């Protein structure tokens, strides 16, 4: 089938400037080639149809180029409404195919992440189970690092990360980071340390505690 | 001039087939081509196949011979019809104009064998050791619970600053999230903060104080 590669992957801006996004077939497709533009909990919607054909109701700022194997969407003076996820579809040959999407961000100082860690409940431990719960909020850029060490030894099964997207608010993003154990393996050790790497700081944000502490 | 709109069951299970229902406002069925779109995690999406204004079929090879859509020309609607499927069935499917002009708002079809379970609600309290600073993270565990989706809230709703929810992961076909707050210091645990989760599916409504 055809594969359509876009790129970039992550598209990070500014309100006001103006962004251009690539979309390449893995072969001609012609013309036959649509833009769409997709929010959370949204359908996506037709923005750009056969490489430069304008859709009705959408915004000036939205234009369409290309032809063959490469294609171009661009956004002349982003607004805070047009971020969110970008995806091209060709028509040419069947099965239609969609690229992989560019997500499209909005830029923001970098903020370093609050981090906090949080020990088995002792409710949980009476079922059975020690989830250990590290939560590491309103951090930019996006890009973090999450390791888990028990009495010093890096862990990774057992770990289970969760992201929020973009926060509409202060455009940070936040991550919970849990380490699932049985009560069994969790009383067999003492400190546990949930440790962030991120570009806010040169050395990673520690936060741990002992079993024999509290 | 014509809006879609999807419905269907949000659970089936790999022994079931899936069925969905678009229903077609404004203009007939047979006025144009439609098709069922689906993404998958990841941002995939897939073109799943059309069906034209008079009936005829084209399906994505990679759904080969699992798929079926078929219209009824008198109530203006037309469905998806999957078989064998699997949990690598599980997305989000909408309804569209063949050329993606008009779309439904979209509807999730989550596959799976899991069994209705509720949920357990454990409370994530501060160590002794970060209770220092201006302000406190608080947290709520939801785990081991199906199908999606719970409602959490804090304090009834009273509380909805600094709040962090995360979205649901699976552990081993059951369902779990955290939800974190932050609140100053001084105010807590003097000011209670309770955890608040809701499970429609296993009528389950219940509070803990963190």
């Known amino acids: 089938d055809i594969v359509l590669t876009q790129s970039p992957a992550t598209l990070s801006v500014t309100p006001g400037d103006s962004v251009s996004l690539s979309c390449r077939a893995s072969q001609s497709i012609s013309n036959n080639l649509h833009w769409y533009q997709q929010k959370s909990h949204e359908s996506p919607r037709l923005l750009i149809k056969?490489?430069?054909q304008s859709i009705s109701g959408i915004p000036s700022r939205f234009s369409g180029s290309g032809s063959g194997t490469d294609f171009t969407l661009s956004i002349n003076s982003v607004e805070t409404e047009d971020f969110g996820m970008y995806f091209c579809q060709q028509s040419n040959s069947w099965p239609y195919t969609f690229g992989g999407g560019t997500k499209l961000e909005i830029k923001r100082a970098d903020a370093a992440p609050t981090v906090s860690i949080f020990p088995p409940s002792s409710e949980q431990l009476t079922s059975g189970g020690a989830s250990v719960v590290c939560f590491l909020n309103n951090f930019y850029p996006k890009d973090i690092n999450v390791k888990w060490k028990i009495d010093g030894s890096e862990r990774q099964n057992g770990v289970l990360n969760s992201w929020t997207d973009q926060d509409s608010k202060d455009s940070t993003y936040s991550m919970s980071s849990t380490l699932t154990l049985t009560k069994d393996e969790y009383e067999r050790h003492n400190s546990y340390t949930c440790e962030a790497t991120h570009k806010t700081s040169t050395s990673p944000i520690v936060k741990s505690f002992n079993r024999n502490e509290c | 001039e014509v809006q879609l709109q999807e419905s269907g069951p949000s659970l089936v299970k790999p022994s079931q087939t899936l069925s969905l229902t678009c229903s077609v406002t404004?203009?007939?069925?047979?006025?144009?081509?439609w098709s069922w779109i689906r993404k998958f995690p990841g941002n995939k999406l897939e073109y799943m196949g059309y069906?034209?204004?008079?009936?005829?079929?084209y399906y994505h090879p990679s759904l080969k011979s699992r798929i079926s859509i078929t219209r009824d020309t008198s109530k203006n609607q037309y469905y998806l019809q999957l078989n064998s499927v699997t949990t690598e069935d599980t997305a989000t499917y909408y309804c569209?104009?063949?050329?993606?002009?008009?779309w439904g708002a979209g509807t999730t079809v989550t596959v799976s064998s899991a069994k209705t379970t509720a949920p357990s609600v454990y409370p994530l309290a501060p160590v002794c050791g970060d209770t220092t600073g201006s302000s406190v993270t608080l947290g709520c565990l939801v785990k081991g619970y199906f199908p999606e989706p719970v409602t959490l809230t804090w304090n009834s709703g009273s509380l909805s600053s600094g709040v962090h929810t995360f979205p649901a992961v699976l552990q081993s076909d059951l369902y779990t999230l955290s939800s974190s707050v932050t609140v100053t210091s001084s105010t807590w645990p003097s000011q209670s903060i309770t955890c608040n989760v809701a499970h429609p599916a296993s009528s389950t409504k219940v509070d803990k104080k963190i």
């Open positions: 056969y490489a430069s």
């Open positions: 569209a104009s063949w050329g993606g002009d008009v």
């Open positions: 069906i034209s204004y008079s009936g005829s079929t």
């Open positions: 404004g203009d007939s069925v047979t006025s144009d081509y």
